[PDB]
Amino acid sequence: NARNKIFISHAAPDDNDFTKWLALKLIALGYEVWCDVLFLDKGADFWKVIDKEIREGAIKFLLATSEIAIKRDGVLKEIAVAEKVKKQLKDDNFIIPLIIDENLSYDDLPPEIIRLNAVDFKKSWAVGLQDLLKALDDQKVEKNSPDPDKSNALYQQIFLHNKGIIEREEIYDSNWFSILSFPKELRFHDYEKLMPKGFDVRELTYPAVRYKNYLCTFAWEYDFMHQLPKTETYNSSQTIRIPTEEILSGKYDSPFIGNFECQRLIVQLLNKAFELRMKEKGVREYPMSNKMGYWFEKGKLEKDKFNKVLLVGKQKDKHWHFGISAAGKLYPFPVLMISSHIFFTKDGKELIESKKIQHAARRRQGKNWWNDDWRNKLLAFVKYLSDDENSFYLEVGSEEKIYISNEPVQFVGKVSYNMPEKNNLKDEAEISDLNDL
């Protein structure tokens, strides 16, 4: 009821930013302030409070003056009430227009406030502040000790009411796909003495890696006999066997080979197995520098869709295909880690040679796609990679296979955010494009 809360009337959204700034600035000085922005629960009685306030608690009536806000009937309604009180208060300088519009013409001001003294913030907010502050002090307005603590409290509580985090569990999908089982034994073979010099281990049907004087694989002793006939004379006793579970647990260290060395070798075998399986799976290949990507041709899938998810489409005069690449990782958990790329083709079959065009189109198409697009496209591809309901397999041996689940490893968090009311993602993409330019 005391006139200590300086009343600031303005257009709810048009003068919102200016008011919110001026309100908190004034508060920091210790000036008590009343405006609609400092308020959260405003319904259909707030005007009654606005009244009880303009008439009972207002040592001043500073009003943002703008063409848009001077056209608003509510603004004129507040003006009329403030005049009525100004006459009762005999303050005259009670109502203090704060002209904030460059193109505002003074004649458009209402005849009620056409002759009053107005602090100008059109030239600048800071310069208008000093003049506003000077007028307030000359009006001997009462102010408490400066408190930016109160302004900070008002800011976070009101300005960030529904812009924070919520303690709500969120389950996330990943690109890590769990590996359900491994072949029981990892076998090293002394094929060298029976292997032609200069032979390539990558050419081997099944995954096999050269290490020291040994060939490492999960395969049986007699599977490369087709490629290496001399292995028909190989002796099984020369083969060195390690239980793979002890390899995953890291409980096997031997003078023959270290745990880390054998784990890297298992990773290499896994990658080669995935490349071979993908070669078998009918997808096309994009030879990346470090890994190999796999993408669908146009018309290979049903309507270029799997699981009702578009994996092949058109961008301008280019055909984008969602491709994946895979790597292995034994720690922290045995997982195949699929990566997602977009590969472009002139017609859907011939990849565009220029890496620069590939990169530009990839960046643009990735800008277009949001969280769902990426997640659903990656899931669809692996769901298509499936050989049964729950997994697919990589052929490491004639009797030995590696089973990878087609559902990615999921991560649970204890915090989440609330979805925005307005989706401005396209504008954000355009703005980020300008940031690049």
Partner 1 sequence: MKELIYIHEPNILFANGQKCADPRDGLALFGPFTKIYGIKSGVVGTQYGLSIFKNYINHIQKPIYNANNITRPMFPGFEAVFGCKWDADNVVFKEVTKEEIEKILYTESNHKRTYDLVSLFINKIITANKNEDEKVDVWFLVIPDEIYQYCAQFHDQLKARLLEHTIPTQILRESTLAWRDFKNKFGAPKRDFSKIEGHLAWTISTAAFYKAGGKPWKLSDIRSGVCYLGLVYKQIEKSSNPKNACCAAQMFLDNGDGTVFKGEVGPWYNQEKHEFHLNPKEAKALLTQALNSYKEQNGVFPKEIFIHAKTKFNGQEWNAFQEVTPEGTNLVGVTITKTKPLKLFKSEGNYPIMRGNAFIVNERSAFLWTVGYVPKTESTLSMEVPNPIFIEINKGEADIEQVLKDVLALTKLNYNACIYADGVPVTLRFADKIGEILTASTELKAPPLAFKYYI
Q: Which span sits near partner 1 by CB under 8 A: 24-32, 55-63, 184-192, 305-313? A: 24-32
Q: How far apart, in whole angstroms, are the C-alpha atoms of residue 63 and residue 85?
A: 15
Q: How far lies 402's CA from each of 149, 176, 178, 179, 398, in Å?
A: 61, 15, 11, 7, 11
**Binds partner 1 by CB under 8 A, chosen from 117, 205, 354, 424:** 424
- What is the full DSSP assignment across 181-201? E--SEEEEE--GGGS-TT--S
d(CA 343, CA 67): 53
Choosing from 107, 165, 356, 388, the residue that interacts with partner 1 (CB under 8 A) is 165
* Token pair listed for 87: 């006459």
Binding-residue total with partner 1 (CB under 8 A): 69
Q: What minimum distance in Å lies between the beta carbon of 291 and partner 1?
A: 10
Residue 280 Cβ vs partner 1, minimum distance, rounded to whole Å: 24
Binders in 230-269 for partner 1, by CB under 8 A: none
- DSSP string for residues in 298-329: TTTSBTTEETTEE-EEEETTEEEEEEEEEEEE
Give whichever of 36 and 173 is closer to partner 1, judged by the CB atom: 173
The rounded distance, in Å, linking the Cα atoms of 334 and 249 is 11
Identified binder of partner 1 from the candidate list 65, 340, 345, 391, rule CB under 8 A: 340
- Residue of the chain from 111, 255, 287, 332 that contacts partner 1 (CB under 8 A): 332
Q: Pick from 47, 155, 199, 256: which binds partner 1 (CB under 8 A)?
A: 155
Nearer to partner 1, 30 or 57 (CB): 30
Distance separating alpha carbons of residues 353 and 412, to the nearest angstrom: 41
| Residue selected from 11, 24, 208, 336 as contacting partner 1 according to rule CB under 8 A | 24
Using CB under 8 A as the binding rule, whether residue 134 contacts partner 1 is answered as: no
Select from 1, 2, 160, 350 the one that contacts partner 1 (CB under 8 A).
Answer: 160
Residue span 112-131 as binding mask against partner 1, x where in contact by CB under 8 A, dash where not: ----------xxxxxx-x--
The angle subtended at Cα 342 by Cα 340 and Cα 345, nearest 5°, is 150
Query: Which of 114, 180, 360, 431 lies at the binding interface for partner 1 (CB under 8 A)?
Result: 431
Q: Using the rule CB under 8 A, is 429 a contact of partner 1?
A: yes
Amino acid, single-letter form, for residue 389: E
Single-letter amino acid, residue 76 = L
Give phi and psi for 93, each to the nearest 5: -85, 15
Say whether residue 68 binds partner 1 (CB under 8 A): no
**β-bridge mates for residue 416, sequence order:** 166
Cβ-based nearer residue to partner 1, 1 or 371:
371
Report DSSP state, residue 29.
T
**Single residue of 51, 120, 173, 285 touching partner 1 by CB under 8 A:** 173
Among the residue ranges 62-70, 218-226, 234-242, 370-378, the one whose residues contact partner 1 (CB under 8 A): 370-378
Site membership for partner 1, residue 360 (CB under 8 A) = no
Tell me the residue type at 272.
K
H or E, element range at 218: none
**3-class DSSP assignment, residue 354:** coil
Question: Between residues 77 and 150, which has the closer beta carbon with respect to partner 1?
Answer: 150
Minimum distance between the CB of residue 364 and partner 1, rounded to whole angstroms? 10
From residue 375 to residue 414, the character string flagging contacts with partner 1 as x (rule: CB under 8 A) and all else as - is x--x------------------------------xxxxxx
Q: Applying CB under 8 A, does 428 fall inside the site for partner 1? A: yes
* Cβ atoms of residues 63 and 10 within 8 Å: yes
- Give the integer Cα–Cα distance in Å for 341 and 323: 5
Helix (H) or strand (E) holding 77, with range, is helix 73-89
8-state DSSP, 54: I
CB of 129 to partner 1, least distance (A): 7
Question: For residues 255 and 332, which CB has a smaller minimum distance to partner 1 in the complex?
Answer: 332
Q: How many other C-beta atoms lie within 10 A of the C-beta of residue 193?
A: 11
**Is-cis flag, bond preceding 332, omega within 30?**
yes
- Quote the least distance from Cβ 373 to partner 1, whole Å: 8
Q: In this structure, are residues 206 and 221 in contact, taking their beta carbons and an 8 Å threshold?
A: no
Pairing verdict, β 119-120 and 32-34 = unpaired
Q: Between residues 189 and 377, which has the closer beta carbon with respect to partner 1?
A: 377
Rule CB under 8 A: which residues touch partner 1?
17-18, 21, 24-25, 28, 122-127, 129, 148-149, 151-152, 155-156, 159-160, 163-165, 170-176, 327, 331-333, 337, 339-340, 366-367, 370-375, 378, 409-420, 423-425, 427-429, 431-432, 434, 437
